[PDB]
Amino acid sequence: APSLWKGLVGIGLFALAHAAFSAAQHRSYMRLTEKEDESLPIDIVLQTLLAFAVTCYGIVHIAGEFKDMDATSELKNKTFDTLRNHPSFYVFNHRGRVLFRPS
């Protein structure tokens, strides 16, 4: 699912860049002709807005973490058996060591 969102964001960005290039070409043409104070075509403007709205949808989905506020829920599954052992104090005196010693 994240890969699809990333690809969609990339495609939208590419479409936005293409719309920018089209608008640049339109203004370059406009500078050629005297007067003619007209606006850019509405179709490419709508394409620009479509590319802007699509890229803002995946930009929120890509980073969604929203962790739980309460601090009791993560330790709701953890068992006291694992907590009983600690990594500081480890005594290396067990029957498994002499049982696994030959093999």
């Binding site: 068992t79 067990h94 029957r95 498994g96 002499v98 049982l99 030959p102």
Partner: protein, 195 residues
Amino acid sequence: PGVKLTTQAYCKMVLHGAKYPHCAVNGLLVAEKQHHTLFVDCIPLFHGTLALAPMLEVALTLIDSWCKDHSYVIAGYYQANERVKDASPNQVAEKVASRIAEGFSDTALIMVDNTKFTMDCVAPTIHVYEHHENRWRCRDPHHDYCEDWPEAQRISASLLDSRSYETLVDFDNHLDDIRNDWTNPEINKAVLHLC
């Protein structure tokens, strides 16, 4: 009075000890009440701290409720120490032995050794202590407590070789997860099939 036990219970005890090789283990053998003392099967009580009466009351009362359901009687209780060079009974063990000796007239204290605990077990590697309300603390020098020895070696070697002992469940796992039972059905199926 001789002490005789079936290979199933001994395999259960060894297997529960293998499940937690870094902490002490606890078990309870069950006999049939109706001179030699025959043991039917054992159930693992707890592991880890192994110095608490509260959960012991729960477990023992549950076992009592169980023994009145299929007409059983609690025979004895066995305990293994954490340190390898330790083969002396702790005070809690004697207290539990006296508690079971109040009701039943034959409670042996079984001690799992740690020095002779390897893949290829020689044979007996069990300490039988004979304790009472008085100051009688004697351990039998060497006797025969298993029925068939070569078959026991073959099944124990097959059980320890093939990694199929992670399914053994304790009373603590029953509290943590109600779903796992504590009768070890798969172990019973395997002991019957291997024979």
